[PDB]
Design a protein around this ligand. Structure first.
Ligand code: ADP
Ligand code: MG
Lengths: 208, 23
């Protein structure tokens, strides 16, 4: 029931034992421009790839709280994997929620969508931009970390129930990965415990 | 009877779900 979604980089997948595991929450920790969003975009297409190709053969649910979701990037990634861009764009559902009111309803909607159709990955970029304001939207939210914790708990339940991979990004069962900047435009990833170098290109995350 | 969602396809198509599913 647990499948590994290729990250687009053989080295990274090798370190991750195949890639992003399904049925669990994988937290990506990294500063700005570490490739957290770019990684999510690549995964939103790889999740649709055939199992043989390291995919979960499923759709992707993208919860954008940073407003950095760009469907065009998915198209470029699709080209690399020889997948019809129209289909990949239709196989990725995205909800751009910055207010807590909408963010609070996304989980419920996600469950219904996953119950009605087959999804393989749920992306949350980013948890940092989540629950910034209170329910009214007028003020700051008290004890945000407590609210965020409950969100992740329910997200883990969806992960276990619908057996979908969940990648949650954080600026600066849960598998925690840290992202960093390499010698040049290369990136380094390692588990919080042994490191791998990957690159960010038009076609998306890859090796070298 | 379907219900609207905040989600939409990257192609721009709005996403809906049956109320019973939300139930
Ligand atoms: N089309 C592209 N080609 C090459 N590198 C890219 C491309 N798009 C983004 N990147 C790289 O992605 C890095 C991280 O971007 P992003 O994942 O959005 O950051 P964050 O992890 O802060 O969300 C940038 O530093 C940039 O060099
Ligand atoms: Mg981001």
């Amino acid at each position: 029931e647990i499948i590994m979604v290729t990250t687009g980089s053989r080295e990274v997948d090798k370190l991750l034992g195949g890639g992003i595991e399904t049925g669990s929450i994988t937290e990506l920790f990294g500063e700005f421009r570490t490739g957290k969003t770019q990684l999510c975009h690549t995964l939103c297409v790889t999740c649709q790839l055939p199992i043989s190709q390291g995919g979960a053969e499923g759709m992707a649910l993208y919860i954008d709280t940073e407003g950095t979701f760009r469907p065009e990037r998915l198209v470029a990634v699709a080209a690399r994997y020889g997948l019809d861009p129209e289909d990949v764009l239709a196989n990725v559902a995205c909800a751009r929620a910055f207010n807590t009111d909408h963010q609070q309803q996304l989980l419920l909607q996600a469950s219904a969508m996953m119950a009605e159709n087959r999804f393989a990955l749920i992306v949350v970029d980013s948890a940092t931009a989540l629950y910034r304001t209170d329910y009214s939207g007028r003020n700051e939210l008290a004890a945000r970390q407590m609210h965020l914790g409950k969100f992740l708990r329910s997200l883990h339940n969806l992960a276990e129930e619908y057996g979908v991979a969940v990648v949650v990004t954080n600026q600066v069962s849960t598998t925690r990965l840290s992202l960093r900047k390499g010698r040049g435009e290369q990136r380094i990833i390692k588990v919080y415990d042994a490191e791998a170098i990957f690159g960010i290109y038009d076609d998306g995350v890859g090796d070298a | 009877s379907l219900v609207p969602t905040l989600f939409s396809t990257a192609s721009g198509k709005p996403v809906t779900v049956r109320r019973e599913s939300l139930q």
